[PDB]
């Protein structure tokens, strides 16, 4: 009641004024995430399509993390990050009008076909380019997984869903919060150790297993049990090691390192020989549902 009204008023001071229903038509829902729904809408004057993320203030586990949408939009735009155009308070929801990634999410490719290493290397290179730039400015995404990687029709790869992100800096060197999606969570984060950008590197390792095997490890375990497993066990293994080149295997072994001090950084991984395999964005295009 009171808490909600108080929060609506806070958000209003940071978002753009007005209501984008005034310039948008034909909202059609295309998906849900952890923090709300995503629709496409048609820009009336142009006929172009944009995405609108709608997040109900009353349905957030940590309502203050909604500010992440504003911090990212304001400050950390980049070629491999979804362009955020404007944000608004529309009744009890935060709406973010953003770039529409019409190629959809990497999850729908990983669940339905088998990527080759040209393709996997293209995805990993693009993701690592985003992370290198984010991590150098102290931003940790904290929810790297195939659902957070979106594609353009011509196969360019962009990071999305920064709702769970946080900042580190000299004054706050490490984060402590239990955040992310259980199967992708880094072991030190499940163990409740102070952690840093290294956690996105482990999560990317898990997404590589998604790209190879179709699923993260322990995916048939309840989320609580899977976390315990990640906390306690040696790094997870591919379901079939013969299906990866020695190069991809060497690459994965620099990501899935339990000790975060020994895990490779995004900076280091950009130089890794596996990425020499990356094809151009055209290599990704045939993987998309409209093409398979």
Curated annotation (Swiss-Prot):
Q: What Gene Ontology terms for biological process does this UniProt record contain?
A: apoptotic process; cell migration; cellular response to starvation; cytoskeleton organization; dendritic spine development; intracellular signal transduction; negative regulation of endothelial cell apoptotic process; positive regulation of angiogenesis
Reported impact of residue 148 to N: Approximately 30-fold increased autophosphorylation (constitutively active mutant)
From the UniProt annotation, give the residues forming the signal peptide.
none
Q: Where in the cell is the protein located?
A: Cytoplasm
**Main subcellular localisation:** cytoplasm
| Annotated active site | 143 (proton acceptor)
Entry annotated with the keyword Zinc-finger? no
List ligand-binding residues for ATP. 30-38, 53, 99-101, 161-163
Query: PTM comment for this protein?
Result: Autophosphorylated on serine residues when activated by CDC42/p21. Phosphorylated on tyrosine residues upon stimulation of FGFR2. Methylated by SETD6. Polyubiquitinated, leading to its proteasomal degradation.
* Phosphoserine modification, residue list: 177
Which residue ranges run through the membrane?
A: none
Using the record's annotation, list all stretches that form the Protein kinase domain.
Answer: 24-275
Region GEF-interaction domain (GID): start and end of each range?
1-26
Cellular component terms (Gene Ontology): adherens junction; cytoplasm; cytosol; focal adhesion; Golgi apparatus
In which tissues is this gene expressed?
A: Highest expression in prostate, testis and colon.
Q: What does this protein do?
A: Serine/threonine-protein kinase that plays a role in a variety of different signaling pathways including cytoskeleton regulation, cell adhesion turnover, cell migration, growth, proliferation or cell survival. Activation by various effectors including growth factor receptors or active CDC42 and RAC1 results in a conformational change and a subsequent autophosphorylation on several serine and/or threonine residues. Phosphorylates and inactivates the protein phosphatase SSH1, leading to increased inhibitory phosphorylation of the actin binding/depolymerizing factor cofilin.
Quaternary form? Interacts with FGFR2 and GRB2. Interacts tightly with GTP-bound but not GDP-bound CDC42/p21 and weakly with RAC1. Interacts with INKA1. Interacts with SH3RF2. Interacts with RHOU and PAXI; the PAK4-RHOU complex protects RHOU from ubiquitination and acts as a scaffold to suppport paxillin/PAXI phosphorylation.
Recorded protein name is Serine/threonine-protein kinase PAK 4
Specify the species: Homo sapiens (Human)
> Taxonomically, what lineage is the organism?
Eukaryota, Metazoa, Chordata, Craniata, Vertebrata
Specify first residue, last residue and whole-protein length for the fragment. Answer: 298 to 589 of 591
């Amino acid at each position: 009641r009171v808490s909600h009204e108080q929060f609506r008023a806070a958000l209003q001071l940071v978002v753009d004024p007005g209501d984008p229903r005034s310039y948008l038509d034909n909202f059609i829902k295309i998906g849900e995430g952890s923090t709300g729904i995503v629709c496409i809408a048609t820009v009336r004057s142009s006929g172009k399509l944009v995405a609108v993320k709608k997040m109900d203030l009353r349905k957030q586990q940590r309502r203050e993390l909604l500010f992440n949408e504003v911090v990212i939009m304001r400050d950390y735009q980049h070629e491999n990050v979804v362009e955020m155009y404007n944000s608004y308070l529309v009744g009890d929801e935060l709406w973010v009008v953003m770039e529409f990634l019409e190629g959809g999410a990497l999850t729908d490719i990983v669940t339905h076909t088998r990527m080759n290493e040209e393709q996997i290397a293209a995805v990993c290179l693009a993701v690592l380019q985003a992370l290198s730039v984010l991590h150098a400015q102290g931003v940790i995404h904290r929810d790297i997984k195939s659902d957070s990687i979106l594609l353009t029709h011509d196969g360019r790869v962009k990071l999305s869903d920064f709702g769970f992100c946080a900042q580190v800096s000299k004054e706050v060197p490490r984060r402590k919060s239990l955040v992310g999606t259980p199967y992708w969570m880094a072991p030190e984060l499940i163990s409740r150790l102070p952690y840093g950008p290294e956690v996105d590197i482990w999560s990317l390792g898990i997404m590589v297993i998604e790209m190879v095997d179709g699923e993260p490890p322990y995916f048939n375990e309840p989320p609580l049990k899977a976390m315990k497993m990640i906390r306690d066990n040696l790094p997870p293994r591919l379901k079939n090691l013969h299906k990866v080149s020695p190069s991809l295997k060497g690459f994965l072994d620099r990501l899935l390192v339990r000790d975060p001090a020994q895990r490779a950084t995004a900076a280091e991984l950009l130089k890794h020989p596996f990425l020499a395999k990356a094809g151009p964005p055209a290599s990704i295009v045939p993987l998309m549902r409209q093409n398979r």
